[PDB]
């Protein structure tokens, strides 16, 4: 029996489908700003508003990851409990107004010393006597000079931020955690983001985060001046020595402000925006923000033989030597990896859902498996071939032919079990990565004649 | 409730990290009776750091070391993590020798790992190896390598 | 300070100064336009005797 | 038992391998400007600057 004269059956085989982006980085700064675990920022307009001291380690590394050529669209800021704030002049010479950017609160003030040639502890001393003596800070934040160096805390529930303003001198926090115990919950709470760096400075706060990073499918970046970077050929006691000791995959690089300026944000803010389909090494990328590293030839040759990467001069300018991990791969080679397996997953699961709802489903006979085909030639392969990322053609002279090629086997040679499974195995994908040009070498002559 | 650097993670986060890491792991289960923290012929100059969880709550002990002598050390973190306001009346810790031992006031669960520093950490068991492979494969047997914690020869045989 | 945030805030910078190390030797490395050329910002300056 | 519905490996066969090179000479002379046993130069203003 039937209740219709006409029935009409409409299914949608549109349904959109999640996908990762490889473009924002986070930080995972001090503070206690904001109560939650991560913020995404657009600007660092919207920073200042929640009330992060200018100069202060997020805004450096927001402002210099926004100031770059490729820089990503927003960035992202994570948070760890803060215990005090700590300013350092040991080993510093000051001749001028040293300025100390005080954010309490949500209200700005900026601490001024007129150096005279004073001694660090005598700075220090007027440094702390000039915060006690504050009108709008006693009550709410305390300030002990002691040796070279200057110690600031808040009392709570007071919120007080430290940022640089003219002068030498460093700021260190410490923290009643640690980013091996704080990853986790950063990561569970909101996933969306590629570039992993941090504030914490010392060895094994790397150690972690780098192998985090690799377990996760993340890229760590970090920035280090110990000067046993570029230490003779057999120092082995750098973090870059540990790391290439270990095969992680982290892109480092010396620099001299790493522990004032943050220049994490400028390496980022050369590739983030560079869609990995265009394989762009980051040979000669200009990188505003960093100094051109100064030494002789044997500390420029000493750092590249631990993969620490140098930022060099020449012909005036500022230029990139070399992207290279710990492991000794190139870092977009390791970009694109991740690139291609996430967008032969996400589309091969797409295809098989949208064809799902419409009934119809996939069928395993040698007239449908050819189809899988036609789905990886589009999206990441052609994507890629059209951007330069994956190397194609056939030369004619040596008859080599660099085409992609894959291989499905068909239903009579799968196993039965499988088949009683339903579960096809032996898929087969081989691409060509596209070398970009790092040296060159040229051969001139001059002649007179020729036989 | 696993901490951090501890050696079930140790172990998940290197199978994890390889070029062909198996799709998933497995944890086996021998009963805990104490961990025991060695610094024995050990150097450090820089911030120890012990991570130890506590009931789903994740706490850093910090040590502050210069020049200083294992049991120097082992005492300050000894002191350290009694005086904890949120340990109290759930751990103990003792220090003796060169090793602290730490042990958890029933029926709270403590783990410990690893930070900062140069030790190693040591677990004892009121079971052995031997007598607890059994009932594991017996209640799945869905694995095919089989690695264990115990260090000492005839854990291994 | 002024150059950072108008280069990160699509701002031109212009400025004026009367460092006579503006035209110092070629190794000075001294004043205020060498710093600003080492950090490849862009800012446009110019050296005048009236500036200040 | 599986827990994916699709599963995709990558492995990179591009790893860069270390190589010698028969260019850089050595001379070993008598001096004692710097502490470390061997300093490369690309100039001799370099050396005059040690």
Do not use: C
């Amino acid at each position: 029996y039937q209740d219709k004269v006409v029935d009409v059956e409409v299914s949608l085989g549109t349904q959109p489908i999640d996908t990762v982006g490889f473009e924002t980085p986070m930080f995972l700064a001090m503070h206690g700003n904001f109560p939650e675990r991560i913020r995404f920022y657009v600007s660092t307009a919207g920073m200042v508003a929640d009330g992060f001291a200018v100069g202060s380690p997020a805004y450096q590394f927001a402002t210099n990851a926004f100031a770059g050529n490729f820089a990503p669209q927003r960035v992202a800021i994570g948070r760890m409990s803060i215990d005090s704030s700590k300013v350092d002049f040991t080993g510093t010479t000051n001749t001028e107004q040293v300025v100390v950017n005080i954010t309490l609160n949500k209200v700005v003030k900026a601490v001024k010393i007129n150096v005279l040639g004073n001694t660090p502890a005598q700075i220090a001393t007027a440094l702390a006597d000039a915060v006690t003596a504050d009108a709008d800070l006693t009550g709410k934040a305390t300030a002990v000079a002691t040796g070279t160096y200057v110690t600031v805390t808040a009392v709570s529930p007071n919120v007080v931020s430290v940022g640089k303003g003219a002068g030498v001198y460093k700021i260190v926090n410490e923290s009643s955690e640690t980013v091996a115990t704080v990853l986790p919950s950063v990561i569970a709470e909101n996933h969306n983001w590629y570039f992993l760096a941090t504030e914490a400075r010392s060895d094994a706060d790397i150690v972690a985060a780098a192998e985090f990073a690799k377990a996760n499918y993340k890229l760590h970046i970090y920035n280090s001046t110990d000067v046993d970077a570029y230490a003779p050929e057999n120092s082995a006691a750098s973090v870059f020595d540990t790391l290439k000791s270990l095969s992680y995959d982290s892109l480092g690089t010396s620099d001299a402000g790493a522990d004032v300026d943050f220049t994490e944000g400028s390496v980022i803010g050369a590739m983030a925006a560079n869609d990995p389909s265009y394989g762009d090494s980051l040979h000669l990328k200009t990188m505003p923000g960093m100094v051109p590293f100064a030494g002789s030839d044997t500390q420029r040759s000493n750092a590249w033989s631990r993969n620490a990467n140098i930022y060099r001069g020449l012909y005036g300018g500022g230029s990139y030597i070399e992207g290279k991990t710990s492991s000794g791969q190139y870092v977009d080679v390791i970009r694109f990896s991740h690139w291609v397996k996430f967008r032969m997953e996400e589309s091969v699961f797409a295809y098989m859902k949208r064809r799902s709802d419409m009934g119809l489903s996939m069928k395993m006979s040698d007239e449908d498996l050819p189809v899988l085909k036609s789905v990886l030639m589009n999206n990441p392969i052609n994507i890629g071939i059209r951007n330069g990322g994956i190397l194609t053609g056939y030369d004619t002279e040596n008859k080599v032919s660099y085409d992609p090629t894959i291989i499905i086997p068909k239903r009579a040679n799968i196993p039965t079990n499988d088949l009683a499974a339903r579960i096809l195995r032996d898929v087969k994908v081989e691409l060509v990565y596209n070398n970009s040009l790092h040296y060159v070498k040229i051969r001139a002559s001059v002649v007179l004649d020729r036989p």
